[PDB]
């Protein structure tokens, strides 16, 4: 729509506007004419309609730039980092996980990757339904002989095959990210931080374990597994210590979601029915979020 008000965003790639209930995202056109991450982010967000992925009302052309629409309210990152412990493990940890996995499964059954998943990518709504957006490095799931990119997702939310250097991966790299969203939501801390380097591999090995030959096979075919040594995987003494605010069935699909095996990683069709939402209490979308 042709309505504008005050701006959000200090980034030089895009500065988003606001107006009407909507938010106009403008890509500055002024090398190449149009960037990869403008057509790459309109061409899959145009064709999805869901209550967990935002949609386009109009994509009307500007004089030089490209206009989109977005959502009004802020994101999941400002919810976690600044509160007075409103969020409670009976109900608030279940509904947002259920809706984010619903959005991830709607991306997956359209065979679209969406390899940029962050709490500043997951954003809420006035009725509190969390949305999946910002498809800036998304890609359709191609033919198996096609070579993909490498560094496609951010550091703190990176799948370990992307740490190791998997050039042509599957779409199981975005279940690891939402499992880290689960742990970041029930721990209220930035989970697995790195020092702007290759140190994400060492902190992931320190947290969840250096993969062994017997279990996730062919991990030594990356020219990175020989650089380091083995670390012990965590046992079920993690149930009380460092994860004491959790239920019995939460650790089952958390450990099934933080599998470092990508072939044995639980896809969303077996994460939406992983008997964790069946346990009491039932969730409800009125949550005390400002």
């Amino acid at each position: 729509e042709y309505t504008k008000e005050k701006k959000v965003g200090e980034g030089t790639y895009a500065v988003v506007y606001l107006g009407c209930k909507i938010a106009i995202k403008e890509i500055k056109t002024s090398k190449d004419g149009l960037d990869m991450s403008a057509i790459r982010e309109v061409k899959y967000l145009q064709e999805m309609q869901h209550p967990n992925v935002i949609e386009l009302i109009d994509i009307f052309m500007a004089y030089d730039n490209l206009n989109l629409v977005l959502e009004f309210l802020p994101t999941d990152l400002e919810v976690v980092i600044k509160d007075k412990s409103i969020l409670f493990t009976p109900a608030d940890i279940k509904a947002w996980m259920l809706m984010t996995l619903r959005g991830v499964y709607h991306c997956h059954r359209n065979f679209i990757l969406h390899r940029d998943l962050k709490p500043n990518n997951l954003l809420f709504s006035p009725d509190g339904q969390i949305k999946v957006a910002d498809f800036g490095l998304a890609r359709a799931i191609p033919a198996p002989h096609e070579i993909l990119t490498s560094n496609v997702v951010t550091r703190w939310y990176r799948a370990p095959e992307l740490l190791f250097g998997a050039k042509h991966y599957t779409s199981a790299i975005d279940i690891w990210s939402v499992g880290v969203i689960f742990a970041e939501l029930m721990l209220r801390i930035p989970y697995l931080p790195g020092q702007n380097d290759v140190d994400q591999m060492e902190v992931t090995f320190r947290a969840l374990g250096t993969p062994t030959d017997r279990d996730w096979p062919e991990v030594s075919s990356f020219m990175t597994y020989n650089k380091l040594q083995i670390y012990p995987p965590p046992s079920r003494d993690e149930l009380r210590k460092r994860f004491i605010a959790a239920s019995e069935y939460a650790l089952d699909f958390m450990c099934g979601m933080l599998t470092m095996n990508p072939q044995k990683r639980w896809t969303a069709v077996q994460c939406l029915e992983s008997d964790y939402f069946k346990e009491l209490p039932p969730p409800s979308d009125p949550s005390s979020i400002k």
Partner: protein
Amino acid sequence: YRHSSQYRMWSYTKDQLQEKRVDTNARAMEEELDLVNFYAKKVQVIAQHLNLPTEVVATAISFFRRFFLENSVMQIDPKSIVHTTIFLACKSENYFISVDSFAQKAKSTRDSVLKFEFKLLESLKFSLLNHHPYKPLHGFFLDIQNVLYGKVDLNYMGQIYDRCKKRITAALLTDVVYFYTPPQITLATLLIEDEALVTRYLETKFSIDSAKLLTIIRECKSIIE
């Protein structure tokens, strides 16, 4: 499929598509259609000339034809669109050619591939992902063998993957993708060998009735002939 961009705003019927032709010839009359088919053949052979996959050739043909459904060939000349559509097709589904590497492999000097780019996306109205019959070829390459075991995979890997692919490139040169869904175009072009393949496939498959689908595939064959 109804949530996809190809169904909700660029899938047509015969009366709606002929109405689209006469309104883009009325807002801007029979030489335009075989002119854009000739230049579609030109962009097909120059896209196949510069060593591209069959997926990006199909998207380039569809982008060129979808550009010239909304604009005529006189107020935008078709001799300059034919180098821009390969660029937006290869930048669409990640081919990854650069601009200068694309210009040195073509007859372009970096300006002739970028000026007709904003208006091509405006007249295209940003339906930049397209569904193509090659993944239904790889699906019905496998679903024949699952339901049938009598006469399989000798001639069907001998002379089907090298023939039906070229027949669907010739189909994308014609006007069939605005009519039917790409599995229906796939099963139409599989009816070249209808001695024992397609009739024995659709009879034993059976929520979806069979005879309506045979009539849809038969009238699609009447369109393509």
